Structures are given as C-alpha cells and as structure tokens.
Design a protein around this nucleic acid. Structure first.
Ligand code: SF4
Ligand code: NA
Ligand code: NA
Length: 596
DNA sequence: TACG
C-alpha cells in the first residue's frame, strides 16, 4: 500500500526476522497472494527452510522447494555429459522422454511415472518440506522425478523457495508463474541475504565467450558433418576465424589479467584479419546459428539433450557485437584459457521486474542503505528492526600498526602482521576465525606462524569443509579463512564455538577491468566511484564477517581489524574502538565478560 | 582509484 517493497535489517534466523516473515505471510494470505522466497545458496536455502518448518507447528505452511530441470532432472546427466546446458534444451529433452513414456516405453525416463502425483510424494513435499537437494535425493531413492513432482505440487503451494537464478530467468519465470496460476502482482517476494542483489543482478546480466567454448563448438562441427556455410567456408573454418580473432585480441591488448575494450573491436578484428565487411561476418554468424539449429534437431531425434555449442556460441557473439557501452563493459581476459565478456555494470535493469511484485529485502547488512538503493534502483522504506544486543557483550576494535595495502606490503609488513596475529591468539586462547583478503596473504602469513590451526584452502570440497567445521566446533582452536569463502557469510556458531574474529587486513576489491569500469560508471552517474565501487562492498564484507560473532542476547565476542585504514569504516561500524595493543585489550575484555 |  505504501510502496512496492520494504527493506529490513536484522540478523538471519532471528526473533525479529521470524516476526517480519510472520507479518509477510499474514499480509500475503489476507490479500490472496502467494509467497516467493529467493535464495542464492544451498546453505541459505536450508536456513530459510528450517525457519519455515518451525513455523509449520504454529501456522498453515503450504510450502515447497522449486528448482529448474538443470538441477532437478535426474535423467540428463545419466544420458549426456554436457559442459554447458539451459532450461530450453532440457524442456525439449524432457517433453520427448515424456511422450515416449505415454506411448509405452517406460524405460525412456524411469523417473516419469505415477509417483509424480502420489499422496506419498505430495506428503513428503508438504508435510516434510525438504530442501531441493534433499528432494532430489528422495527422488533418486524412490525412482521419481524431482522436477515433475515439484511442478505437480506447485498449484497447491502458497509458498515457494527457489533460487534467484531460477526466478530471474524471464522465460522460465513466465512458465513458472503461469503453471503456479498467478500474476506478478499476486505475490510477495522475500529476498534472502539481499545485500547480494547487486552482484546477483550483474552476474545474471553478464555473459562471455571463451576459447574452450569455441573448441567445444569445433568438435561439434566435426561430429555433425562440418558443412559449407558459404563459398569455401565450412563451420570449422568460421570457428577458427572467431577463435583466432579472440586469441589475437588477448595477445595484443592484455598484459596482466583483464583489460577494458570497445564491443566493436571484436568485429573490427574479424573484418581486418579475414578481409570482409561487417555484413559478411554477420551473415556468417547467422549461418553458424542455423547450423546450430540443425545440430539441435539431429540430437533431439536420437533422444539426446538438444543443446548446441555452435548455437550458443553464435547467439553470444551476436549479442556481444550489439551491446551498448553505457550499461556494459566489454572485458577481454587471458584467464580461464582466454575469453571476451559483456560485464553488466548496472544490476537495476535485471532486478526491475521484481518491482511488479511486493519485495521484502532481508539482510543483516543493508546499511548504508542509500548506496543499496542507488545500486539496485529500489526506492523503498528502510527499517532497522531486530535485537539491540547489549554493547558491553561485544568488543570491536582496529589496530593501525599494520595494513594489507598492496603498494606498502613487503616482507617486513608480513612479519609484523603474523607477529600481531600470533600474539593475539596465544594470549587470548579463544575460538577464533582469522579472515584474510586473499589465499596469497593467508599462505604468506601462515608461513610465519607456529600455532596449530585449521585452514579453508583454495578448492576445498564439501566433505572436507563440513569436516573441518565439525572439527572446529568439537576440538576448538583457530581457523584461517578467506574473505570470499564459505565462512564469511551464512554460518552460525552458537555459544562459545566462536568467540573471536581477526581481520588480517581489509578485503578491498582488486582494481581489475570490471572494477575500474564500475568506478567510472559510478563517477559519471553519482560522482562517487570511490564510495560505490570500493568503500561500500568492502564495508559489507567487514559487517558480514563481524555478524558471525554475536548470535544471541547472551553471546560474547571480540572482533579486531588489523589494518591502518580501518578508521574510515567507523561510519558503518560506530562501536569500533582503536587499540594500540589488541592482545591485552581483547584478553582484558574476556576477563571482564567472564566476571560478568 | 583498491590488489584474487
Ligand atoms: S521426467 Fe524428470 S527426469 Fe525425466 S526427463 Fe523429465 S525432467 Fe528429466
Ligand atoms: Na533406484
Ligand atoms: Na580447425
């Protein structure tokens, strides 16, 4: 009634968060509106679903998970080994399988059967409220399609939990809404961990063309006849023109990592190297897309997933050649084998469709809200609901004797940082996560310390990570973690499982091509490149990490930032003190906390 | 105008 949404800041899994949710479900039910809960990770899906299970004992909870065939089709990964995939190709795949089962070939998909609609399947979904992953597993266990089972339950569900990537895919969203029986103005969308929304928008809005993707198209060309596209140019010949253009661009234009270019430079290289006009190259690119259509048709008629690398490559290159420089940066990279990318700078375009529904923007760290509102384009009321935790139970401080600042980071600054970290841990003797801006800084600091610790290392798998986490809760001590990893957001350590956090430097972003573009974009639009591309994301990282510490009225903890430049984050963390020796001051804080 |  007031606006098209509301932004609520308060810790996750909390009393006032559950309340806001309870208020949203009553408001929704009163106006015959269904509820859509969007989440970005399995971890956050589980937290949200746990919350809803508690509430099912008090109130009417008619809820399911919903994910797309990409995650929920059991068959296609058993039948194909594809490295790229989409909703569209799987719809064509599945429809063909379902035809074959209706015509008497039950083995075509053995997951497509009566159990899709059975009382037992409907009961597990509605009475048990599984995560998507748990329901996937239940599907395997019972030889029943998770996707089609979710789809069949959908019309009777008042509440759906789904990924951002699922709902923000327009064509998938239209079919979902259509099968749910509802328009966009007939729903309330809860945006879990909404501080991710800008990155979510930019991520969904961006696309790229890699050399490996071209290589995959090259092999596809061999396998399906490699026909003439025009006078003496076969499909493979065109892929070589595209691949060599991209390779030459990378060699000639990038040094260390990514570089910004103009979108039309790709077309320029194609034109000069192969001695053709723009029309001729565009005609060839269209011919490649048509060959893609043929590849789809061929795969489809033998029961394969009709996804074509030639099609995907063709449509992405054509899209790249026609992007407008205003909202998008053309990025050229040597990383991951070589690629060219349309990087979305402004996520408000992608997020705009969410205004057609009511949105509730939930997060522990939305402040400073002006920046969030400017970046997402959401002009909505902001409220700091939630517990005022007693300030005496928390100590937040920074120490200015060291810094992770790049151009002053030599071996002596590293020695200094390690010494301070070691002094704190050995004196305080509490359960600690040390957060590093990079694996590089972590490894170099790790090489200068003696104390035992666990480590969240680059490329660690799910089993090793849960094991280390369960070891931390049980055996206690110290974890070395990195800013972009899985301990920075999300995870809850109740009681004295987490008592201290040390930020070994500040996690300022890299001045890469995308970030240097964001700076220029926010300079032009607001005159505040520094604040919006550098200060803001850094502030949120810091607050998210500190937010791990106090999870209760009676919870006790210390956070210390080991960086000179931390004073400039006082505006966002007002209780932060300076300390000239954190070891004693944190030690003394715990003595006083223990005395009560 | 920052440094995975
Ligand atoms: S029924 Fe399910 S498992 Fe079978 S093809 Fe369709 S989506 Fe895949
Ligand atoms: Na089975
Ligand atoms: Na070739």
């Amino acid at each position: 009634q007031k606006s098209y949404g509301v932004a609520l800041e308060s810790p996750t899994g909390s009393g006032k968060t559950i309340m806001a949710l309870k208020s949203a479900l009553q408001y929704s039910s009163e106006r015959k509106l269904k509820v859509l809960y969007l989440v970005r990770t399995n971890s956050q899906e589980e937290q949200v679903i746990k919350e809803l299970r508690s509430l099912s004992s008090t109130m009417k909870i008619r809820a399911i998970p919903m994910q797309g065939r990409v995650n929920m089709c059991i068959l296609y990964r058993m039948v194909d080994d594809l490295h790229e995939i989409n909703a569209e190709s799987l719809a064509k795949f599945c429809n063909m399988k379902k035809r074959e089962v209706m015509a008497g070939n039950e083995a075509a998909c053995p997951y497509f059967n009566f159990k899709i609609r059975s009382d037992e399947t409907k009961r597990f979904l509605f009475d048990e409220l599984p995560t998507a992953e748990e329901f996937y597993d239940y599907g395997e266990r019972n030889n029943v399609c998770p996707y089609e089972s979710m789809k069949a339950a959908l019309p009777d569900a008042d509440i759906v939990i789904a990924p951002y990537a699922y709902f923000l895919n327009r064509s998938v969203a239209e079919k979902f809404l259509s099968h749910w029986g509802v328009s966009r103005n007939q729903i309330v969308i809860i945006l879990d961990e909404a501080h991710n929304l800008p990155d979510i928008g930019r991520s969904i809005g961006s696309f790229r063309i890699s050399v490996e993707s071209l290589n995959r198209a090259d092999r596809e060309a061999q396998a399906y006849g490699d026909p003439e596209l025009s006078q003496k140019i076969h499909v493979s010949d065109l892929i070589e023109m595209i691949r060599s253009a991209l390779q030459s661009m990378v060699s000639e234009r990038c040094g260390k990592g990514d570089v910004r270019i103009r979108f039309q430079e790709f077309m320029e290289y194609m034109r000069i190297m192969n001695k053709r006009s723009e029309r001729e190259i565009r005609s060839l690119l269209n011919a490649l897309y048509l060959f893609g259509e043929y590849v789809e048709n061929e795969k489809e008629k033998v029961g394969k997933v009709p996804f074509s690398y030639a099609s995907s490559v063709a449509s992405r290159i054509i899209a790249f050649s026609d992007q407008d420089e205003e909202k998008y940066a053309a990025i050229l990279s040597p990383e991951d084998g070589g690629y060219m990318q349309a990087a979305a700078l402004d996520p408000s375009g992608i997020l705009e469709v969410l205004k057609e529904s009511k949105t509730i923007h939930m997060s522990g760290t939305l402040d400073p809200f002006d920046f969030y509102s400017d970046i997402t384009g959401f002009e909505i009321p902001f409220k700091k609901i939630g517990e005022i935790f007693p300030p005496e139970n928390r100590y937040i401080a920074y120490y200015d004797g060291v810094s992770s600042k790049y151009d002053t980071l030599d071996e002596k600054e590293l020695d200094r940082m390690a010494t301070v970290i070691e002094d704190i841990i050995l004196k305080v003797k509490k359960n600690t996560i040390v957060y590093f801006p990079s694996y590089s800084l972590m490894d170099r600091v790790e090489n200068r310390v003696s104390f035992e610790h666990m480590k969240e290392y680059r490329g660690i798998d799910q089993k090793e990570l849960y094991s280390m986490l369960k070891k931390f809760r049980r055996d206690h001590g110290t974890i070395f973690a990195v800013s972009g990893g899985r301990l920075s957001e999300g995870i809850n350590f109740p009681g004295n499982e987490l008592e201290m956090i040390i930020l070994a430097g500040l996690p300022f972003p890299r001045p890469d091509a995308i970030n240097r573009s964001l700076f220029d974009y926010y300079c032009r639009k607001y005159g505040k490149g520094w604040e919006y591309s550098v200060v803001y994301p850094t502030a949120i990282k810091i607050r998210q990490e500190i937010g791990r510490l106090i999870r209760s009225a009676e919870d006790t903890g210390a956070a210390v930032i080991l960086d000179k430049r931390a004073g400039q984050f006082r505006k966002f963390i007002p209780d932060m003190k300076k300390t000239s020796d954190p070891a004693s001051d944190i030690y003394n804080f715990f003595i006083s906390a223990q005395a009560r």
